[PDB]
C-alpha cells in the first residue's frame, strides 16, 4: 500500500557497510511512503565533481532528497549545497563534517538543513558553563564569519536581564586587514585584563593568533579561552599552538553515531513525505534533470512539513534557519598531553559536569566561616540562575550524609552577605587574594574538648590553608 520516493546518500572520505546495515533494518512501514536508498561513495570533493554527480543521480533516478555526509573541515562545501537546493527545489540534509558546519543567511527558496547547533545556542551554552563559577564575559572576534552579528547581539541580550553579577564587555572587533605592520592587533591584547576571554574565529587565524597571545603574555596559566565549535571541531587533529583548553560545544564526538545519524535523516525525509501524502494526498513529482528547468509551488509545503518532524523519542524538528532545536551537546577540555578527553553533558536547558571545581585553579587560599546574625548571613540561591549577584561568594557548604559516600562540595552554593564578607572583598583588592569560601560542618565553632579543638579552630589546627573570618572573639 505505501508507494516510494527516492533518497540518495553520499559519503565522502568510509565503512559503507555499517551505514548500510544500520538503516536497512528500519521498517518504515506503519508509515504512508517508504524509502529507496542508493549508496554512492566519492573522494574528489571538488565543486564540479559534486554538481556532476548530484544532477547525474537526479537525471538517472527519481530522487526525492539527498543525505550528504563528509569527513573534512571545509565550510564552503555547505554553501555549494545551499546553492543547488534552491536550484533544484529538493531537500538536502548535511549531517557530518563541513556539511555540518553552520552557514548563516541561507536563501529564501532553499530547502537545505543541517545537523548542528545554531550560532546563538553555542553562546547560550557558553553562558550556562560560566554560570557554574561566576566568570566574566570578555569576547573578542578577529575574523569575520557571516555569523558574527548574531553573536554579540545574543551575548549582550542576557547581561541586562536580572540578577546578573556580570562584568563589563571589553570587546575587540578586528578584521582581515592584510597588513603585517599593523601590530596593534598584538598591542591591544594587553587591554584584556580579564581571566576569561571568548574567541569566535576561524581555525587558521586562531592558530596564528595564539602565537601572538603567547607573545604578549596571555599564557595558559592565568587565563583560559572558551572557543566555539567551528574552530576546534575536528576531533581527530590539533595544531601545536593550543595550550588553551576548555574549548566549547561540539556534537557527540562520534557522529548515537554516524549510521544512526543516517537512519535519523532517512526517517526525517520519509516522515515528512508521509505527512504530505496523508494531508494533501499527492507527493511532489521528481525533477527531470539539471538541464531542464521549466516544468514548483509544493516545495514550500514540503519546507513547512520538514520542520515539524518527530520520531520515536526524538523531536528532530528544525528552525527557519536550518539548524536543530533540541540537539545533544558535549563539552571538551584540552589535555596538556595534547588529547581531547572531557565528555561533558548538556541537554535542552541543563548542564551536568565534573568535580564541581575547576582543576588547575601561591596566592590561593581556603577560608572557612560560620553563619550567624548580621556578620555572615547565609541565604539561598536564585531559582533561575544559581549564582548570586550582590553576594559575590560561593560559600560551598558541605553536607553531612550517610557514612558510605563522601561529603558534598557540589551542594548548591548558598549566598553569603554581611559585614565580614564586605570586609573580605576590600582585603582582596588590598593585597592579592583568591577565596575558597566554605562553612563549617560539625557546628562546633570555638571549642576545645579533651585533647583537641573543633569547629573553626578545629579546621585551623588541622592545617587546611585557612583563615577564619566571621564572628570569632
Amino acid at each position, epitope marked *: *500500500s*505505501p*508507494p*516510494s520516493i527516492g533518497i540518495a546518500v553520499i559519503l565522502v572520505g568510509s565503512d559503507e557497510v555499517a551505514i548500510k*546495515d544500520a*538503516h*536497512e*533494518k*528500519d*521498517d*518504515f*512501514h*506503519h508509515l504512508s511512503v*517508504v*524509502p*529507496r*536508498v542508493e549508496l554512492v561513495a566519492m573522494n574528489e570533493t571538488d565543486p564540479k565533481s559534486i554538481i556532476t554527480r548530484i544532477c547525474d543521480l537526479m537525471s538517472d533516478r*527519481k530522487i526525492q532528497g539527498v543525505v550528504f555526509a563528509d569527513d573534512t573541515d571545509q565550510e564552503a562545501i555547505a554553501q555549494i549545497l545551499d546553492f543547488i537546493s534552491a536550484q533544484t527545489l529538493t531537500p538536502i540534509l548535511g549531517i557530518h563534517g563541513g556539511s555540518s558546519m553552520i552557514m548563516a543567511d541561507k536563501d529564501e527558496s532553499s530547502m537545505f538543513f543541517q545537523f548542528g547547533p545554531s550560532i546563538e545556542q553555542q553562546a547560550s551554552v557558553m553562558l550556562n558553563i560560566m554560570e557554574e563559577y561566576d566568570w566574566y564575559i570578555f569576547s573578542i572576534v578577529t575574523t569575520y564569519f557571516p555569523g558574527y552579528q548574531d553573536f554579540v547581539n545574543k551575548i549582550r541580550s542576557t547581561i541586562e536581564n536580572s540578577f546578573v553579577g556580570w562584568e563589563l564587555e571589553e570587546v575587540l572587533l578586528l578584521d582581515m586587514s592584510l597588513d603585517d605592520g599593523d601590530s596593534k592587533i598584538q598591542n591591544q591584547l594587553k587591554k584584556l585584563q580579564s581571566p576569561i576571554i571568548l574567541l569566535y574565529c576561524t581555525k587558521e587565524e586562531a592558530t596564528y593568533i595564539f602565537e601572538v597571545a603567547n607573545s604578549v603574555g596571555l599564557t595558559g596559566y592565568g587565563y583560559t579561552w572558551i572557543v566555539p565549535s567551528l574552530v576546534a571541531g575536528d576531533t581527530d587533529t590539533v595544531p601545536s599552538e593550543f595550550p588553551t583548553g576548555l574549548i566549547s560545544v561540539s556534537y557527540d564526538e562520534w557522529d548515537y553515531g554516524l549510521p544512526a545519524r543516517v537512519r535519523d535523516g532517512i526517517a526525517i525525509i520519509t516522515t515528512a513525505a508521509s505527512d504530505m501524502l496523508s494531508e494533501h494526498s499527492f507527493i511532489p513529482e521528481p525533477k527531470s534533470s539539471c538541464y531542464n528547468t521549466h516544468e514548483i509551488y509544493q516545495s514550500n509545503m514540503l519546507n513547512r512539513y520538514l520542520i515539524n518532524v518527530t520520531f520515536e523519542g526524538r523531536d528532530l524538528s528544525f528552525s527557519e534557519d536550518g539548524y536543530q532545536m533540541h540537539p545533544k551537546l558535549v563539552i571538551i577540555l584540552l589535555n596538556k598531553e595534547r588529547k581531547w578527553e572531557r565528555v561533558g553533558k548538556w541537554k535542552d536547558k541543563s548542564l551536568q559536569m565534573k568535580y564541581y571545581v575547576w582543576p588547575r585553579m601561591d596566592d590561593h587560599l581556603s577560608i572557612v566561616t560560620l553563619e550567624e546574625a548580621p556578620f555572615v548571613i547565609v541565604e539561598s540561591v536564585d531559582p533561575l540562575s544559581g549564582t548570586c549577584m550582590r553576594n559575590t561568594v560561593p560559600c560551598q557548604k558541605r553536607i553531612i550524609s550517610e557514612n558510605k559516600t563522601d561529603e558534598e562540595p557540589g551542594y548548591i552554593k548558598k549566598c553569603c552577605k554581611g559585614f565580614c564578607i564586605d570586609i573580605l572583598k576590600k582585603i582582596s583588592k588590598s593585597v592579592k587574594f583568591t577565596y575558597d569560601l566554605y562553612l563549617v560542618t560539625n557546628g562546633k565553632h570555638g571549642k576545645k574538648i579533651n585533647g583537641t579543638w573543633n569547629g573553626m579552630i578545629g579546621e585551623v589546627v588541622m592545617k587546611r590553608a585557612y583563615m577564619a573570618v566571621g564572628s570569632l572573639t
Partner: antibody, heavy 116, light 106 residues
Framework: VKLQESGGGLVQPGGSLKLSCAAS??????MSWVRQTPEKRLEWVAY???????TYYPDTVKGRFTISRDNAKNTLYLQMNSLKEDTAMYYC???????????????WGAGTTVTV | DIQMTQSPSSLSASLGGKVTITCKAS??????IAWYQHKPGKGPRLLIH???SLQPGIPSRFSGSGSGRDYSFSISNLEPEDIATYYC????????FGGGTKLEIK
C-alpha cells in the same frame, strides 16, 4: 546464506497450512513468496517487510490469510487457504538489498509443493 | 495495489530462434523490470536489470528494450539446458506480477 523451505501440504481441501522457509543475514531482509500454477505462473502470495510490518497480498489470495515472520529463526509464517484449486509449488525468495523496500533477488529458496 | 499482466502465452521457437515477451502494467513503471527463468520444478534464474543489465554467469543471449510501462525482452541463440519460463517483476507498490509464458522447442 542459503534458503530452505519446509511445511508443505494441502491435506485439508480448503484448510490452513503454515509454511516456512529457514535461512542460514536475513534480519534486515524482507520477504515475499511464490506459488506456481498448472500454467506454472509465479503468482505472488504475500508481502512482509524485514521488520514485520507492511502485511499485504495481491488480489488472488486476499481475505483468508494470516501472516507473520520471525527474523530470529529466519522464517516466514503464512497459512494457505485459497490454493485449493491448485497443485502448486511454493518457494521462498529473499529480495536483495534488504529494507522495507524491494529489489531484485537472485536469493530465492529451493522449491517445495502443495497438492490438493 | 497496482497489478500487472504479461502476454502472450508462448515461446514457440526453434533452436536459436527469436522470442520477445512484454512487461505490460496498469501504471507507469519507469523501467522497473526484472526477468527470471526456470525449469518445471527446479527454480528461477535471474536475467535482467533496469537497462537490461545481464548477470555474471548469464550469457549475452538475452536483450531487451522499452520504457515507461511497456517493455520487450528478447531471447535468441538458446541452448536447451534453458528449458524454462520467463518472468517480469515490478515493485511500484510492494511487488507486482502478471502472467508470463513458458518455453517450448520446435
Amino acid at each position: 546464506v542459503k534458503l530452505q523451505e519446509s511445511g508443505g501440504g494441502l491435506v485439508q481441501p480448503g484448510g490452513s497450512l503454515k509454511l516456512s522457509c529457514a535461512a542460514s543475514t536475513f534480519s534486515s531482509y524482507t520477504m515475499s513468496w511464490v506459488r506456481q500454477t498448472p500454467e506454472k505462473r509465479l503468482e505472488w502470495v504475500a508481502y512482509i517487510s524485514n521488520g514485520g510490518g507492511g502485511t499485504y497480498y495481491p488480489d488472488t489470495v486476499k481475505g483468508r490469510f494470516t501472516i507473520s515472520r520471525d527474523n530470529a529463526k529466519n522464517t516466514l509464517y503464512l497459512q494457505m487457504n485459497s490454493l485449493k484449486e491448485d497443485t502448486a509449488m511454493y518457494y521462498c525468495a529473499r529480495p536483495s538489498r534488504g529494507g522495507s523496500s524491494y529489489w531484485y533477488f537472485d536469493v530465492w529458496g529451493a522449491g517445495t509443493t502443495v497438492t490438493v | 495495489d497496482i497489478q500487472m499482466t504479461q502476454s502472450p502465452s508462448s515461446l514457440s521457437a526453434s533452436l536459436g530462434g527469436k522470442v520477445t515477451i512484454t512487461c505490460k502494467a496498469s501504471q507507469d513503471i519507469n523501467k522497473y523490470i526484472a526477468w527470471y527463468q526456470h525449469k518445471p520444478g527446479k527454480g528461477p534464474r535471474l536475467l535482467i536489470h533496469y537497462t537490461s543489465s545481464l548477470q555474471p554467469g548469464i550469457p549475452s543471449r538475452f536483450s531487451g528494450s522499452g520504457s515507461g510501462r511497456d517493455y520487450s525482452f528478447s531471447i535468441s541463440n538458446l541452448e536447451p539446458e534453458d528449458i524454462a519460463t520467463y518472468y517480469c517483476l515490478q515493485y511500484d507498490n510492494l511487488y507486482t506480477f502478471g502472467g508470463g509464458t513458458k518455453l517450448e522447442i520446435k
